[PDB]
Structures are given as structure tokens and as C-alpha cells.
Amino acid sequence: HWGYGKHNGPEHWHKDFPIAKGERQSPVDIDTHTAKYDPSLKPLSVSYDQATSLRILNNGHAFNVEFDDSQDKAVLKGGPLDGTYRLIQFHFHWGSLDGQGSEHTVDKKKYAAELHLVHWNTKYGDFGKAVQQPDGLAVLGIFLKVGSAKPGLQKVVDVLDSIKTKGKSADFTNFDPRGLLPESLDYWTYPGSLTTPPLLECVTWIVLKEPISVSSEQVLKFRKLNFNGEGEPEELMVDNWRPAQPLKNRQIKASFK
Numbered sequence: 024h025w026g027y028g029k030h031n032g033p034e035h036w037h038k039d040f041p042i043a044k045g046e047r048q049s050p051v052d053i054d055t056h057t058a059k060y061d062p063s064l065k066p067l068s069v070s071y072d073q074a075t076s077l078r079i080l081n082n083g084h085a086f087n088v089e090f091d092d093s094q095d096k097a098v099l100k101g102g103p104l105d106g107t108y109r110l111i112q113f114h115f116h117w118g119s120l121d122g123q124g125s126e127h128t129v130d131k132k133k134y135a136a137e138l139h140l141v142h143w144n145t146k147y148g149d150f151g152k153a154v155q156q157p158d159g160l161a162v163l164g165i166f167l168k169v170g171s172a173k174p175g176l177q178k179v180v181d182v183l184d185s186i187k188t189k190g191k192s193a194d195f196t197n198f199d200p201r202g203l204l205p206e207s208l209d210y211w212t213y214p215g216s217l218t219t220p221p222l223l224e225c226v227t228w229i230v231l232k233e234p235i236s237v238s239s240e241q242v243l244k245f246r247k248l249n250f251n252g253e254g255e256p257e258e259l260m261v262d263n264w265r266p267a268q269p270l271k272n273r274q275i276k277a278s279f280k
């Protein structure tokens with residue numbers, strides 16, 4: 024029953040999930056002038072050569088591209104992280120209009136969309152145990168702006184017709200998430216949360232500075248998805264983003280000068 028409408032959207036979530044008003048909630052605004060360069064941050068390691076995508080699912084809130092995480096095949100390491108974090112899924116948040124859609128903001132600027140590559144810390148054995156720990160997850164966040172098409176996204180865009188409604192899934196093998204990465208791995212990092220219920224405070228956020236460009240046609244196809252199930256009243260899957268939350272007692276660190 025939580026969602027993104029007038030009666031069940033982000034300002035209501037605290038009633039079922041009181042941690043919504045917690046001390047390390049996400050997303051946040053990234054104030055680029057107050058983030059401090061941290062020369063001790065190690066370089067980020069994104070090792071996606073052996074990634075094994077399996078399936079694409081409309082879960083009623085976003086679409087997830089799911090990966091085989093039963094072995095160390097697509098891993099994130101380095102940066103602010105200790106140990107090895109395994110890719111489980113990616114998804115996006117987007118707007119009804121190009122002027123909004125991202126969850127994180129940069130000096131209050133909203134991008135058209137935001138990609139989340141979700142990874143779990145292998146020392147906790149599985150995703151469900153990992154989300155109960157303060158260092159359980161690492162989410163790589165990448166902003167999308169509208170301009171030139173992203174060739175590596177098109178395979179995703181073109182399957183969306185087959186998962187229009189909530190609960191639909193489709194086979195989605197051999198998708199290479201390297202084709203969704205900008206050139207630079209310069210990032211900001213801070214401790215935060217899942218940005219949807221249950222809003223668990225288990226995430227090391229790593230948000231890349233360089234956006235990727237996608238075409239207006241690509242993002243228009245995201246906006247034809249539905250929040251509803253098949254044979255229910257059509258409600259377009261748009262504006263599935265949580266707004267910026269208070270920073271509280273946290274510092275955002277930059278990997279670059």
C-alpha cells in the first residue's frame with residue numbers, strides 16, 4: 024500500500040516505517056561546495072565482465088534487472104568499501120517530465136532519472152541478512168540527463184513492452200551493465216538508506232559525478248510503464264522518486280578535487 028501517489032507517497036511512509044524520519048535516510052542533496060575531498064579514498068573497482076543477468080521484473084514501483092549473485096561474478100570493491108559486494112539488481116527512478124526524476128540532487132539540481140546498481144556485502148552471506156547491517160549494501164548511483172541516446176540502454180528499453188504491468192517478468196539474459204557506465208568513476212559517498220520501504224539504514228551510497236546521456240525517446244519509454252497490475256485502472260509509472268532527506272549528522276566525501 025505504500026507508493027508514490029497523493030495518499031500513499033513519501034510523506035506518508037513514516038506511519039508504516041518510522042525509520043523514515045531516522046538519522047541516516049536517503050536520498051540527500053549533494054552540496055558540491057561542502058563535500059570534502061578525501062585523499063584516503065581508494066579507487067573504485069567495478070568488475071562486471073562476468074556479470075550474468077537473468078530476468079527483468081516490474082514490481083509495481085520500478086523495474087529490476089536481476090543478476091545471478093550465487094557466485095562472485097559482478098562485484099564492486101574499493102572506494103570507501105571494505106570487502107566485496109556482489110551485484111544483485113539494477114533499477115531506475117524517473118520523472119513525468121525531464122526536469123525531475125532523480126532521487127539524489129546536486130546543488131538542488133534534479134536530473135531526469137537515476138540508475139541504482141545494488142550490491143550486497145558478501146561477508147553476510149545473502150541480501151536478506153545484509154540489509155540488517157549498517158554496512159550491508161553498496162548502491163552505485165548514476166544520474167541520467169536527456170540528450171544523446173545511450174546505446175547500451177536500448178536492450179532494456181525494448182523489453183519494457185513485455186513487462187508493462189505490476190508482477191510481469193521476462194527473461195533477460197546476457198545484458199552487460201558496463202554499457203550503462205559513464206567514462207569517469209569520480210564519486211561522492213555517504214552513509215544512508217534504502218530509498219523505498221523498508222528504508223533500512225544499511226547502504227553505503229556511491230554516487231557518480233558524471234551523468235550518462237539518454238535520449239528523449241528512451242526515457243519516454245520508461246514513462247509508458249504502469250504501477251498497476253494488468254486489468255486494473257492504468258496509472259503511469261512516473262515520478263517514482265523519493266525527495267531529498269535531511270542530512271543530519273553526516274558528511275559527504277568526494278573522491279576527486
Ligand SMILES: NS(=O)(=O)c1ccc(-c2ncc(CCl)[se]2)cc1
Pocket residue numbers: 139141162216217218219220221
Ligand atoms: N532505491 S534503493 O537502491 O535504495 C533500493 C534497493 C533495494 C530495495 C529492496 N530490495 C528488496 C526489498 C524487500 Cl522485498 Se527492498 C529497495 C531500495
Ligand SMILES: [Zn+2]
Pocket residue numbers: 114115116139218
Ligand atoms: Zn533505487
